């Protein structure tokens, strides 16, 4: 009732805390976005590297195979 109603002073105080909390939230999401871009570029790079190494191995395998059968 009377206790369970905020005063103007109290309402203002909540506004300050709420703003602060929202600011922290926004800034934390900015950083997350930056981190995700990083993760994304890392994963793109990585898979490209795997693909290259793969088809390297695949080439090496076929060349070992035909060269084996090349004699005689």
């Amino acid at each position: 009732p009377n206790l369970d109603t905020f005063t103007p002073e109290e309402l203002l105080q909540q506004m300050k805390e709420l703003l602060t909390k929202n600011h922290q939230l926004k800034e934390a999401m900015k950083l997350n976005n930056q981190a995700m871009k990083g993760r994304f570029e890392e994963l793109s790079a990585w898979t490209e590297k795997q693909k290259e190494e793969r088809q390297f191995f695949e080439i090496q395998s076929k060349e070992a195979k035909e060269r084996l059968m090349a004699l005689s």
Partner: protein, 43 residues
């Protein structure tokens, strides 16, 4: 500042506060998973 207005103002404020508590919760989950991304390439 009137009774009716403050009551409704207080009710809104508490709700926003509560809703924000759940939002930061989600933020925390998001962060948890983001951390895990970093380990996908690592073996």
């Amino acid at each position: 500042p009137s009774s009716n207005t403050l009551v409704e103002m207080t009710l809104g404020m508490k709700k926003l506060k509560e809703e924000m508590e759940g939002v930061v919760k989600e933020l925390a989950e998001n962060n948890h998973i983001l951390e895990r991304f970093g380990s996908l390439t690592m073996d």
